[PDB]
Symmetry: C4
Subunit: 222 residues, 4 copies
C-alpha cells in the first residue's frame, strides 16, 4: 500500500528475528556455567525492551501475533497489516531460531529451549497460566502506548521489558514462559516435538483478547 | 458518576489479585533449585512496577491496605473510597491465592508463603523491621505521586517497584517481607498456616502511618502560607 | 527552620540507607548473599531515597558528596556541617538499630570494611578514588540546573551508578563511597583496621570529580 | 569552539578509561567468589549507562570505535573528530588496562572463545550483536522519535547488557574493539584477535545502513541534498 508499510513489516521481521535469536540463544548455551531463571528472564525482557525502542518507533514493535490481534481490537491496525505482521513475525521467528541453530554448537542444541510441560501440570493449568501472563503483558503494552499518558523518555520500553521478565519468572517456572506463539513455534519447527503446542498457541490469545477488551472497555475506555 | 468509581474498585481488585498471583507463585515454586533472594525481590518489585504502571494510572494501585491508610492521611482526607479499596484488595488477594493453588499442581504447594519469623527473630523486632520497610515504601510512593512532582512523572512505577525490591531484600532476610496486609492474609487463609499473623497486620500499618505523618509534617507539609 | 527540615531529611536518608544497606549486606546462614544482591541493595536504596528526600533536600546521603557540592554549587558552610553531622548520626543510629533487631549468631560483623584477597592501602585509596569519582560525576551531571530543560532518570541513574561501584568496589573491599556507611559499623563493632583509607579514598576522589566536572569537563 | 573539541576528545578518553576500569575490574576472576554472567553484563551495561549520561551529555559518549565509525556514516560527524575520537578510545583503553594491572595481585577479562566450537561463525555472532546495539543507539537519539526529550543513558546501557549476555556466552562479547584490544595488547593472547576487530565494525555499518537507508532515512537538509544532487 505504501513505503512506510513495507518498512514496518520488515522492521517486524527483523525484530522477531533478533528477539528469538537473542532469547533462545541466551537461555540455551549451558556449559559448566549455568544460566539462571532471573538471567533468562532478564535476557528476553531486555531484548523486548531494546527492539521496542528502536523498531518500536518505526512500526510499534509487536514482535508477537498475540499483541497483534489484541492490538487489532484497538491499536488502529488493519487486518491487512495484521496478516503481513503475523507473517513477518512467524518467518522472522523461524529465521532467528534457525540462524541460532546454525551458529550454535552441536553438543548443546538439546531441546532448543522449546516450551513444554514442566513438573507435571495438566494442559488446562498451563493454559490458565499463559492466559494471565499474556493478560498482564498486554495490559502493560497497552498502558505504555496510551499516548494520553505523560512519560519520560524510554521508561515505557523498560517497563514492558521488565513485564516480560516477571512473566518469564512465573511462566519459566511453569511452561518456560511462552507469551508468544512465534517464540514457541520457531524452536519447534527448527528441532521438532510439537508436544503440547495447543496450550501455547491458545494461552496468550485468550488473555490477549481478554486483556485488550479490558483496557478498552472495562478499565480505561477512551 | 459512579462508573469511574466502579472501574477504580475493579482495578484495585484485579491488580491485587495479579500481585498475589505473581508474588506467591513466583516466590514458592522450588522444584529443581532454590528461589534466589534477588530473584524473589525482583519478582515482587517488577510485578508491583507493572501493575502500578497500568492499573497504577487507572487506580493509583495501592495494592496495599497500609498504603491505603497512609493515603487516607495524606493523598486524600477520610474516604469511603479508602474503605472500598481495602475491601477490593482483600477479595483480590484471597481470590488470587486460591486461583494460584488451583493452577499450580499439588506438588510444590509448600507453605504457600506465610512468611514466618525466620532466623530466630522475635515479634517486636519483626514489627519494627516491617514498620521501616513500609516506611520507605510509603515515602517513595508519596514522593512520586506528589503534586510537586507532576510536571514530568519520571519513572514512578520503576522507582516504586525497585523500592519494593529493596524492602524485599531486607524483609525477606527477616520475616519474608510483608509490606502488605492483604498479601499476608490471603495465603494464611488458603493454606491454613496462621503461625505469627498479627506482626504484619501491626507492623506495616503503623509504619505506613508514621511515614505519612513524617512526610506530611516533619518533612514536607502543604504550604502553611503561600508566602514561600 | 526549613533548613532544619533539610538536615532532618539527610538524617533520615542516611538512617534508612545504612539500615537497609548493612541489613541486606549481612551474611545470613539460610541464603548466602551474592555480590549482585548487595549491589542491588545499596543501588536501589540510594535510588528511592534520592527520589523522596531528593525531592526534599537533594538527598546527599554522603558527606563526600556534600563536600563535592560545597566546592561545586554555592552551599553554606553551616549547611554542609549540619548535613555531614546529620548523615553521620543517621548512619550510626541506623546501624545501631540493625544491631538491635538482628540476632547475635548472624551479626558476624555488620559488614565492616576490610580489604581482602591481598592488596595494600593506597591501592584501595585509588580504587575508591575512582569509584567516588564516577559517582560524583554522574550525580553532578544528573542534577544540573542549566540542563533542567531536559531531565532524564536521575534517581535510577545514580542508584545504578552506586550499583556498579558496588560490583567492583565490593569485589575489592565492599565499596565504601560513603564515610558514614563505613563508620557506623565501625563504631558499633570496635574493628577499625585500615579505616582511614576510606575516609581519604572516596573523599579526595569526589573533590577531584567536582573540580574536574566543573573546571575541566564542563567549565562556564 | 576550539576548546569544546578538546573537551570532547578528553571526555572520550576519560569515559573509555573508567569504562575499561570497571568492566575488566568486575570482570576479573576472583578466587572463591565466582562472578555470575549477569553480574558482568550488569557491570558493563550500568557503566555504559552512567558514562553515557555524564559524559554522554558532554561528548555524545561513543566509547566504541565501532559506533564512532557508525556515527561517521550517520550522526553528522567529520573524519577529523572521528579519528581523534578513535585515538582517544584506544589510548584511554590501554591506560585503564595498565592501571588495572597496577591494581591486581598476580586472564584479565580479554575475550576469546571459551567453549571451543564454531569459531568463525561466532564472528557472525559479533555481527548481530553490534547490529542490535547500533540500532538501539541510533533510535535512542532521533528528533523524529519525539517523546518530549531523548537519549535515556539507560536506553543504550541496557542494550549493552543484553548484548553482553549473548556475547559472554559466545566470544565474551566484543561490541567495542578498544575493550577487546587493551588487555590483549597487555597480554600475549591474540588468539582470534581479528575476529573482534571485524565483528562490530561490519555490524555497526550494516546497522547504520539499515537505520539510514532501509528503516528510517534521515530528513535531508537542502544544503546536503544539493551535495547528493551534484
Amino acid at each position: 500500500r505504501s513505503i512506510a508499510f513495507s518498512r514496518a513489516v520488515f522492521a517486524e521481521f527483523l525484530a522477531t528475528l533478533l528477539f528469538v535469536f537473542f532469547g533462545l540463544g541466551s537461555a540455551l548455551n549451558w556449559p559448566q556455567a549455568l544460566p539462571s531463571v532471573l538471567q533468562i528472564a532478564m535476557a528476553f525482557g531486555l531484548g523486548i525492551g531494546t527492539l521496542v525502542q528502536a523498531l518500536g518507533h518505526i512500526s510499534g514493535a509487536h514482535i508477537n501475533p498475540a499483541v497483534t490481534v489484541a492490538c487489532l481490537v484497538g491499536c488502529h491496525v488493519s487486518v491487512l497489516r495484521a496478516a503481513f505482521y503475523v507473517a513477518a513475525q512467524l518467518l522472522g521467528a523461524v529465521a532467528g531460531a534457525a540462524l541460532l541453530h546454525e551458529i550454535t554448537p552441536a553438543d548443546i542444541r538439546g531441546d532448543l529451549a522449546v516450551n513444554a510441560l514442566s513438573n507435571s501440570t495438566t494442559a488446562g493449568q498451563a493454559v490458565t497460566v499463559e492466559l494471565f501472563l499474556t493478560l498482564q503483558l498486554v495490559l502493560c503494552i497497552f498502558a505504555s502506548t496510551d499516548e494520553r499518558r505523560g512519560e519520560n523518555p524510554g521508561t515505557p520500553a523498560l517497563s514492558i521489558g521488565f513485564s516480560v521478565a516477571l512473566g518469564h519468572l512465573l511462566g519459566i517456572h511453569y511452561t518456560g514462559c511462552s507469551m508468544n506463539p512465534a517464540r514457541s513455534l520457531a524452536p519447534a519447527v527448527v528441532t521438532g516435538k510439537f508436544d503440547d503446542h495447543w496450550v501455547f498457541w491458545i494461552g496468550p490469545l485468550v488473555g490477549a483478547i481478554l486483556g485488550s477488551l479490558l483496557y478498552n472497555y472495562v478499565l480505561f475506555p477512551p
